[PDB]
Amino acid sequence: MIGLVGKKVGMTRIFTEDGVSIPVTVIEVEANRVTQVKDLANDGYRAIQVTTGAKKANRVTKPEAGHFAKAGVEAGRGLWEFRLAEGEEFTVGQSISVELFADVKKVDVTGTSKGKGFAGTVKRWNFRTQDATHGNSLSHRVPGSIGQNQTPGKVFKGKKMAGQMGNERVTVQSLDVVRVDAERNLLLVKGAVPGATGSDLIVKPAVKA
Amino acid sequence: SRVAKAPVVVPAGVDVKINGQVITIKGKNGELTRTLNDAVEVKHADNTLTFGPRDGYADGWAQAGTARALLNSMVIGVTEGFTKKLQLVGVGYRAAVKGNVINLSLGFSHPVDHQLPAGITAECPTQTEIVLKGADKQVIGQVAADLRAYRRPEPYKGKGVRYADEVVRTKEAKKK
Amino acid sequence: MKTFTAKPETVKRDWYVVDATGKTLGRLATELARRLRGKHKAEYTPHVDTGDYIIVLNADKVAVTGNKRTDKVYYHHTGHIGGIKQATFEEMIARRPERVIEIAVKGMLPKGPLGRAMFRKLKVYAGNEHNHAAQQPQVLDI
Amino acid sequence: MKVRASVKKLCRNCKIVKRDGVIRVICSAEPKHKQRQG
RNA sequence: AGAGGGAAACAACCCAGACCGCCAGCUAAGGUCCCAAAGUCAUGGUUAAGUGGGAAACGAUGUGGGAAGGCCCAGACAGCC
RNA sequence: GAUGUCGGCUCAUCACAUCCUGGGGCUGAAGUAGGUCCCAAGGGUAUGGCUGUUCGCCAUUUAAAGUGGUACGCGAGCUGG
RNA sequence: GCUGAAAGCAUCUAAGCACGAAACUUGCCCCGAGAUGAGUUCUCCCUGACCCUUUAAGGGUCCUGAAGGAACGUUGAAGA
Ligand SMILES: [Mg+2]
Ligand SMILES: [Mg+2]
Ligand SMILES: [Mg+2]
Ligand SMILES: [Mg+2]
Ligand SMILES: [Mg+2]
Ligand SMILES: [Mg+2]
Ligand SMILES: [Mg+2]
Ligand SMILES: [Mg+2]
Ligand SMILES: [Mg+2]
Ligand SMILES: [Mg+2]
Ligand SMILES: [Mg+2]
Ligand SMILES: [Mg+2]
Ligand SMILES: [Mg+2]
Ligand SMILES: [Mg+2]
Ligand SMILES: [Mg+2]
Ligand SMILES: [Mg+2]
Ligand SMILES: [Mg+2]
């Protein structure tokens, strides 16, 4: 099934009447408007392109404005594609609401994880810290050895080193749908999802069980 | 050779149709079709079939002897068909066929259901017996092997699916 | 009087179609390598690409002798440690049938900038149809 | 299964068979006699 | 203290001893499908293992060739009663 | 006219003659549990006491506490017993 | 394992057919068209003169400056 594009509102909890606290992530899912439908004939694959939210007319460019005018929808804050499964039909301009997840039990949420910047090997790869005392000289959080002697004579590709951590696409799979509030454009999933408050999220039904 | 040098008499009621190498045979029990190897040409005649090694191939005589035995069973399948009987040995073991699916209870925690392939019939005269009937000798032998594979006869009490004819050789558990 | 040398500006190249159906992989590749390089033209010079453009159809129908259909292995290393990948012939055919002929010919071409330029004149197609009718390619019954 | 470099008939019922380029010994009487060259 | 050609690369192996020049020819070792100059040469065989393109004792109804031998239409060998 | 030499730490990587998990054959395989061989390298594969120790012994775990290569991997990374 | 000759039998194999493992190829996640073999789709923008010369993927002057971009500023759960 296709998914929806929402916004991470934040985290809260839902008390069940039998005394269980469920940590939930509130996802604001406004109406996703279909802006383009791709088919095998013209594009070689079946998919829809949706937009969501609103955008000030002074910030949309003429190339983007003409794309939205072609579909007859108001300009959103971005465009996202969803591969169509066999049997799903959508028309351009059609609006898709959060009630699509009315009977969906588990979802996969995709977002951009929070950026940690340049991270050391201790933080990024869970390397073990060397001794803090016992003679250690300037080598407390350094990665240690990075290879073998002359026989390889090089560092292997994919070696775990310090570098940029976070600020990348991350998918969390099989999150229980706690509540679908159609009239308020809310979707409550159990657990935590990638990204900071206010970031865009892509919510699809769970590809696994 | 010695098998290929014995012509196969095709009786009345059944017909043959040679189309280059692909051969087909119709009869009362059904119809069969089979492509023969390029190393052998089959010569049609009066109601008897002759196989010989086609020149240009060294293994013709070995390949010819197979086609002889192949269609010799093809003509038997379209007239008499083939039958194989399995007998279940062991308490609780009982089979029952409904439609083209066997319902075996071989002591597993789950029911095992084997789907018959198109062209093979089955029936259970009793709970601990199953008889299969069909035209193709190879396919009826394959199905019997699969049912036997669900619970192969163990060598201590003979329990499991076995062929009604074959003899299982048991052995005792050495004490002490 | 110096020996004649072909000039890249004045060399003419023809277009050809080859049906790889049933052809032996190697004995077809050598004939392609000759014509891609231009060894069949009297104006052949080593440092100039005087070859022809060749279109190969039905690349998935190419034939091999012996047990090579299941035993010929194509190795390649991804550059990552332990990244030695392999694929037999018939799965190369099932996945990327054009790669089989392209790999065979690539090994028979010279190595270097000119060799890579000759390889660009080879258009391999898995199916029977090609969209180079505008080039009017001549049937090469090889 | 005995996997050895020298396979031989161990009784009257042992039969030598070559399957897929591997010399094997199959015995309809003694399962201990089952061998394969390797 | 010896270049050249061959042996993929390879002082000591194989061919062969560089006075200089040539956009001439014939050969040696070694080669002649493509990389890469020259036979997708001819005739008759063998191999199916990519053997060729690494290895022993030993094992094996792989297969080719050869010379004999036992038994056999007084019915042998195999199968079946 | 210098290739820093044991062990530890950190970080590894490959081989398979496999320690666990997976698939099998045989068993002097009733079951449970084993023995042995074949296939299999995807992942996994202890913490302490003593000793500079590798190792080993011991205690207690674990599905298991694999064997080796890598300048007896790794001092322009640490340590210096 | 099935069928089955070579080898009147037998035989999982030689022709043919079926099973079969955390290995293999997929399936899951991420990167990814500098994939120079540089791909595809959608949308947007630009519709003036004139001279020279060896006359062509030529040079020059005047007019024109779009879509968009960059810069600058306020900044960010983005960041050396
Ligand atoms: Mg940040
Ligand atoms: Mg520590
Ligand atoms: Mg110091
Ligand atoms: Mg190197
Ligand atoms: Mg040389
Ligand atoms: Mg001299
Ligand atoms: Mg000459
Ligand atoms: Mg040549
Ligand atoms: Mg010839
Ligand atoms: Mg070899
Ligand atoms: Mg020095
Ligand atoms: Mg190691
Ligand atoms: Mg092994
Ligand atoms: Mg895998
Ligand atoms: Mg060391
Ligand atoms: Mg060092
Ligand atoms: Mg000291």
- What's chain B's Rg over C-alpha atoms? 21
Q: How many CB atoms lie within 10 A of CB B140?
A: 23
- How was this structure determined? It was done by cryo-EM
Burial class (CB in 10 A: 0-12, 13-18, 19+), A62: exposed
Q: B99 and B40, same structural domain? A: no
Assess whether B45 and B64 both reside in one domain. yes
Last residue of a domain, one of B46, B78, B110: B78
Residue of C nearest to A152 (CA): C81
Give the count of alpha carbons within 13 A of A76, CB side only.
23
Residue among B85, B158, B90, B92 nearest B125 (CA): B85
Strands (DSSP E) found in B120-171: 120-123, 129-134, 160-163
C80 has a chain A CB within 8 A of its CB:
yes
Phi, psi of C16 (to 5 degrees): -135, 155
Same domain, B66 and B89: no
First vs last C-alpha separation in chain A:
14
Domain match, B39 and B88 both: no
DSSP state of C48: S
Query: Which of B35, B53, B78 delimits the end of a domain?
Result: B78
* Strand E bases, protein C-beta under 7 A: 23, 33-37, 40, 48-50, 56-62
Q: At residue B16, what is the residue type? A: V
Examine the domain organization and report whether B87 and B53 are in the same domain. Answer: no
B57 and B42, same structural domain?
A: yes
Residue A179 and residue A190: Cα distance in Å, rounded? Answer: 9
Long-range pairs, A75-78, Cβ under 8 A, ≥24: A75/A51, A76/A33, A76/A51, A76/A52, A77/A51, A77/A52, A77/A53, A77/A200, A78/A5, A78/A51, A78/A52, A78/A53, A78/A200
The residue out of B78, B97, B131 marking a domain boundary is: B78
Q: Which bases of strand G sit closer than 7 A to a protein CB?
A: 1-19, 25, 27-31, 37, 40-45, 67-69, 77-80
> Is D8 within 7 A of strand E by CB distance?
yes
Q: Give CA–CA dist C10/B166, Å, rounded.
A: 83
Residue A120 CA and nucleotide F54 C1' are separated, in Å, by 33
C-alpha dist (Å) from residue C109 to B14, C5, C28, C30, C42: 61, 21, 14, 9, 19
Examine residue B101 and state whether it is found in any structural domain, yes or no.
yes
CATH code at position B86: 3.90.930.12
In chain B, residues 46 through 75 whose Cβ sits under 7 angstroms from any atom of nucleic acid strand G: 59, 61-66, 69-70, 73
Q: How far is the CA of A137 from the centre of ligand 3 (A)?
A: 6
C79 interaction partners in chain A (CB closer than 8 Å): 157
In degrees and rounded to multiples of 5, residue D26 shows phi and psi of -115, 140
- Identify whether B158 is part of a domain: yes
Residue B46 sits in which domain range? 8-78
The burial class, CB within 10 Å (0-12 / 13-18 / 19+), for D26 is middle
Taking phi over 0 as left and psi of -120 to 50 as alpha, with beta for the rest, A74 belongs to: beta
Dihedral sign for Cα C82, C88, C94, C99, please.
positive
Q: How far, in Å, from the CA of A151 to the mean position of ligand 4?
A: 9
Q: Is the CB of C33 under 7 A from strand E?
A: yes
Rounded CA-CA distance A94/B144 in Å is: 57
Residue A162 CA distance to nucleotide F46 C1' (Å)? 30
Identify which of C40, C43, C45, C18 has the alpha carbon closest to the alpha carbon of residue C101.
C18
Helices (H), chain A: 62-71, 121-125
Boundaries of domain holding C115: 1-142
In a domain, B31, yes or no: yes
CB distance A80 to A176 below 8 Å: no
The number of domains in chain B is 2
Cα separation of C21 and C63, whole Å? 8
Domain count, chain C: 1
Are the CB atoms for B148 and B141 separated by under 8 Å?
A: no
Alpha carbon B76 to its chain centroid, in Å, reads 11
* Backbone φ/ψ region at B121: left (φ over 0), alpha (ψ -120 to 50), beta: beta
The terminus-to-terminus CA distance of chain C in angstroms comes to 38
- Contacting residues for A3 by C-beta, under 8 A, at least 6 apart: A82, A202, A203, A204, A205
Resolution of the coordinates, Å: 2.1
